[PDB]
Design a protein around this ligand. Structure first.
Ligand code: SF4
Ligand code: SF4
Ligand code: FCO
Ligand code: F3S
Ligand SMILES: [Mg+2]
Ligand code: NI
Lengths: 260, 544
């Protein structure tokens, strides 16, 4: 028997699902064949419609219980009808699935904190999972988060228990350090060597991107340490950090190309 | 003959799984065939509303989150859009880098779609257990190049792994699969099921490599971070070592496309020949992609190596030029306020007004984009017909190769089978161009690493960004006022393909394609999935 995992998609772009399948320790096939039982996942599951909905119920009714992964924020306006699956408001199905879950893992800034659809003026009245349900969640933010961080947290929760969280529900294992503190451009920052524009010689020489809006100094994530796709990260590609793992970054980190 | 029940009655499939986003399909069935259809998108986010009043430089970061499956493409469209609004012509290297990242995205996107989203509609995974592995190996040896992953040992290993999974009774993502316990609409012999399933697992690994290649130039995947107004920020992406690695990875991915993807697509298509007469539409549109000149939207349209164009009524002899002024969106059958019909995207309005579930008068969060009164299919099939009609050498070669292999006329491509084939066709063509495109940017970058041009934010302006994303013709339209976003409208390929009826009550491409779909078993309507999935729906994209 492999531990049951129910994965719900709410108000999301599916970038978090995509991030998750970029895992290489283990690869996704090995994860779902050997380590977990992924019992509902709309992006890749075979069943559709009534058959899919029956698959969800079978998982929610499972004798061994289940862990809940939530992707996307919850649109709450008009009784939650602006976001629906199988004729039910997303808020309704997420509430129900969360009630008897062994644990709740929010993959991405959207489920964790509200995300892009919550940004002003928030026409769908989108909320993060913890706010909408009124329960604590394990938050794995980033837009999307590193698969290392998501799979890392899943494994930890299944084997060891709940990992130490910060004030924003993020595992200290992955979000304990500022991006900036591990950035290879830090010497330039310390020396006040800033690129004034993307076309400047300074930018060509790899100068710090702080003057171009880099939110690395206020962003908790492990991007420079672990990289993405085993090859790169935004600052290495010459672009400032957006602060995408911070709550409500869409409204607290903008304008993205300024520090104002 | 095509298995068909006698069922008369409605069928609702919600959720449509193995797509991006939340789609509800409703159909009326009579004597086992769909007679009417509705494409009902079930989520609204409202990125266009959220963008109002914001810094135009921020738009690409918000719009990229329109979709994480077709990641990058919206950052690209927004950047082209703002670049046009501020009237900046990006450096040659930036055009090259932006186009290569789009090429990498096509490779990743199409592989995942065929195997992990579409394949389960044609392949019976559990039947793979009944296959003779040795027999499967020799079969695979006849329809595709020699490779260790196609040996009896390797195929048996897959079958054993699958066998242990099924025997556990925890079927996970295969729970209640339409093919469990046999299904008349699934035709493949067990050996083919095993071969396809082995490649399905290989492709889960290969898509990681595809994403890594893309991230070398993109910074990360999903959601790239290398584009800026006036070009790109990734100076390292022009250097020798990273591009050597980019080429190496890209060739691995391309080997898998040519060894596994195309041969499986051809094998599957030969068994489902009847699907070459189901799910056709008549009008095709493409903005084109991979241009040699991206200094303006018109230069993009004229110089795209995958050409732009408009085909109407299946007439492969009259490919018209795209008229950007002719595009508009209707809201009559959508969840938006009345009086929003016929809006050109520069005058686009997004005023949500929900009614109720299954209201025939308003049944979707997608707008209905129309072109001179007609619905337009966009995507790989659209690009393929247009390129074929214009006599694009690569498209001529690869399409004729496919038409030969399946022994059908070019008219058979107007179908769900054709729609599926075209996705494989252009993937092979992208692969064939990779080494050339890379060498171009490698040589160029070595000589002069200029990557971002100077520009100035205008007080008042408008601009449009065009791209042909993996699913089709994408456009972002901006009005700038007081140096801020006054209006920002997205018109996305899935909006074209899967939106609701227009103001005249004319069906969208998916709704028309579903008419005439045979239903072998109403409770397991795999045929609806086959056609819907062939359009490669992206609902977060379509609604935004
Ligand atoms: S957190 Fe970002 S990547 Fe994940 S679903 Fe939300 S918008 Fe998409
Ligand atoms: S580039 Fe950003 S993260 Fe790196 S040193 Fe500068 S401010 Fe810090
Ligand atoms: N491809 C893709 Fe996504 C859609 N539809 C976009 O643009
Ligand atoms: S934008 Fe996000 S992915 Fe890392 S580099 Fe900054 S936190
Ligand atoms: Mg729009
Ligand atoms: Ni998409």
């Amino acid at each position: 028997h492999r531990p049951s995992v129910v994965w719900l998609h709410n108000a999301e772009c599916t970038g978090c699902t995509e991030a998750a399948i970029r895992t290489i320790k283990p690869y996704i096939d090995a994860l779902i064949l050997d380590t977990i039982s992924l019992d509902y996942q709309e992006t890749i599951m075979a069943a559709a419609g009534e058959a899919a909905e029956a698959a969800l119920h079978q998982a929610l009714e499972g004798k061994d219980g289940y862990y809940l992964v939530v992707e996307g924020g919850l649109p709450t306006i008009d009784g939650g009808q602006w976001g629906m699956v199988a004729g039910h408001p997303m808020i309704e199905t997420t509430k129900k699935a969360a009630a008897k879950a062994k644990g709740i893992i929010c993959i991405g800034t959207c489920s964790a904190y509200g995300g892009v659809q919550k940004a002003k003026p928030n026409p769908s009245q989108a909320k993060g999972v913890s706010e909408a349900l009124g329960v604590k969640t394990i938050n794995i933010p980033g837009c999307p988060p590193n698969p290392i961080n998501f799979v890392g947290a899943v494994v930890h929760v299944l084997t060891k228990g709940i990992p130490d969280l910060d004030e924003n529900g993020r595992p200290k294992l992955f979000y304990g350090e500022l991006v900036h503190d591990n950035c290879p451009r830090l010497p330039h920052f310390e020396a006040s060597e800033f690129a004034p524009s993307f076309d400047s010689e300074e930018a060509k020489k790899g100068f710090c991107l702080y003057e171009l809006g880099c939110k690395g100094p206020v962003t908790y994530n492990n991007c420079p340490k672990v990289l993405f796709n085993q090859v790169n990260w935004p600052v290495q590609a010459g672009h400032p950090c957006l602060g995408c793992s911070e709550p409500d970054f869409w409204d607290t980190m903008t304008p993205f190309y300024e520090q104002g | 003959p095509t298995p068909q029940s006698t069922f008369t009655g409605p069928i609702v499939v919600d959720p449509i799984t193995r797509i991006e986003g939340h789609l509800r399909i409703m159909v009326e069935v009579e004597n086992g065939k769909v007679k009417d259809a509705w494409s009902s998108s079930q989520l609204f986010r409202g990125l266009e509303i959220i963008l109002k009043g914001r810094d135009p430089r921020d738009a690409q970061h918000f719009t990229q989150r329109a979709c994480g499956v077709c990641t990058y493409v919206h950052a690209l469209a927004s950047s082209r859009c703002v670049d046009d609004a501020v009237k900046v012509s990006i450096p040659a290297n930036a055009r090259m880098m932006r186009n290569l990242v789009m090429a990498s995205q096509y490779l990743h996107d199409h592989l995942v779609h065929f195997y992990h989203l579409h394949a389960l509609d044609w392949v019976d995974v559990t039947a793979a257990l009944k296959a003779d592995p040795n027999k499967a190996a020799k079969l695979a040896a006849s329809i595709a190049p020699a490779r260790p992953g196609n040996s009896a040992k390797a195929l048996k290993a897959v079958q054993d792994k699958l066998k242990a999974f099924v025997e556990s009774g925890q079927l996970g993502i295969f729970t209640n699969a339409y093919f469990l316990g046999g299904h008349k609409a699934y035709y493949l012999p067990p050996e083919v099921d095993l071969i396809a399933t082995a490649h399905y697992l290989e492709a889960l690994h290969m898509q990681v490599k595809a994403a890594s290649a893309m991230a070398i130039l993109g910074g990360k995947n999903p959601h790239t971070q290398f584009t800026v107004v006036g070009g790109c920020s990734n100076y390292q992406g022009l250097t020798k070592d990273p591009l050597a690695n980019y080429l190496a990875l890209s060739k691995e991915v391309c080997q898998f496309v040519n060894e596994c993807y195309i041969p499986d697509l051809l094998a599957v298509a030969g068994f489902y020949k009847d699907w070459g007469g189901i799910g056709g539409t008549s009008n095709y549109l493409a903005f084109g992609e991979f241009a040699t000149d991206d200094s303006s939207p018109e230069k993009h349209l004229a110089t795209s190596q995958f050409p732009s164009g408009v085909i109407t009524g299946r007439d492969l002899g009259k490919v018209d030029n795209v008229d950007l002024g002719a595009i508009y969106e209707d809201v009559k059958y959508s969840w938006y306020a009345p009086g929003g019909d016929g809006k050109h995207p520069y005058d686009g309005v997004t005023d949500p007004k929900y009614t109720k579930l299954d209201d025939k008068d308003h049944y979707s969060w997608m707008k209905a984009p129309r072109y001179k009164g007609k619905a337009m299919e966009v995507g790989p099939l659209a690009r393929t017909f247009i390129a074929y009609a214009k006599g694009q050498p690569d498209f001529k070669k690869v399409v004729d190769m496919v038409l030969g292999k399946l022994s059908v006329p070019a008219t058979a491509l107007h179908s769900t089978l054709g729609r599926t084939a075209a996705r494989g066709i252009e993937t092979a063509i992208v692969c064939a161009n990779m080494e050339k495109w890379i060498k171009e940017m490698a040589d160029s970058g070595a000589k002069d690493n200029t990557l971002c041009a100077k520009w100035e934010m205008p007080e008042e302006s408008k601009g449009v960004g065009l791209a042909d994303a993996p699913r089709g013709a994408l456009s972002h339209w901006i009005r700038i006022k007081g140096k801020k976003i006054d209006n920002f409208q997205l018109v996305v390929p899935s909006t074209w393909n899967l939106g609701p009826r227009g103001a005249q009550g004319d069906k969208s491409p998916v709704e028309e394609a579903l008419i005439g779909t045979p239903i072998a078993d109403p409770k397991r309507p795999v045929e609806i999935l086959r056609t819907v999935h062939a359009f490669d729906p992206c609902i977060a994209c379509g609604v935004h």
